Each structure stands twice: as C-alpha cells, then as structure tokens.
Amino acid sequence: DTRQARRNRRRRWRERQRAAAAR
RNA sequence: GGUCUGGGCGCAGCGCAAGCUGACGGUACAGGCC
Structure with missing residues (x-):
C-alpha cells in the first residue's frame, strides 16, 4: 500500500473511531 | 442512510550519497451498490 492508500484507508478507521x- | 477504495501534489525532518515518513494537509478530492 502507498502513503495515500494507507492515509485514505486510515482516515476511515480514523474518523470512524x-x-x-465522539458518540 | 450506510459502506469501501485510492493516487498526489504540499509543508515539515534527516544524509559524503542514495531515499523515506508524519491516529498531518486531509472530515479534501476523485469514483463506487439500494
């Protein structure tokens, strides 16, 4: 995985968590 | 209403050289199934 792919994939886990x- | 993917190009940090990176840009953008 590239920096973006991970960065993109991460923000999903990121924002999701x-x-x-938040909730 | 929900879920999944990804390429930068940027600011920073380090080296006889060669390279890489930031629960950062970026809750972006570009595209997905009912």
Missing part, C-alpha cells in the same frame, strides 16, 4: 469516540 472518531464517530464512536
């Missing part, structure tokens, strides 16, 4: 954390 974001939602859970």
Whole structure:
C-alpha cells in the first residue's frame, strides 16, 4: 500500500473511531 | 442512510550519497451498490 492508500484507508478507521469516540 | 477504495501534489525532518515518513494537509478530492 502507498502513503495515500494507507492515509485514505486510515482516515476511515480514523474518523470512524472518531464517530464512536465522539458518540 | 450506510459502506469501501485510492493516487498526489504540499509543508515539515534527516544524509559524503542514495531515499523515506508524519491516529498531518486531509472530515479534501476523485469514483463506487439500494
């Protein structure tokens, strides 16, 4: 995986854990 | 209403050289199934 692919894939886990954390 | 993918090009940090990276840009953009 490239920096973007991971970065892109990460922001999903990122924001998602974001939602859970926030919620 | 939900879910999945990804290429930069940027600012920074380091080296006889050769290279790489930031739960950062970027909750972007570009495209997906009912």
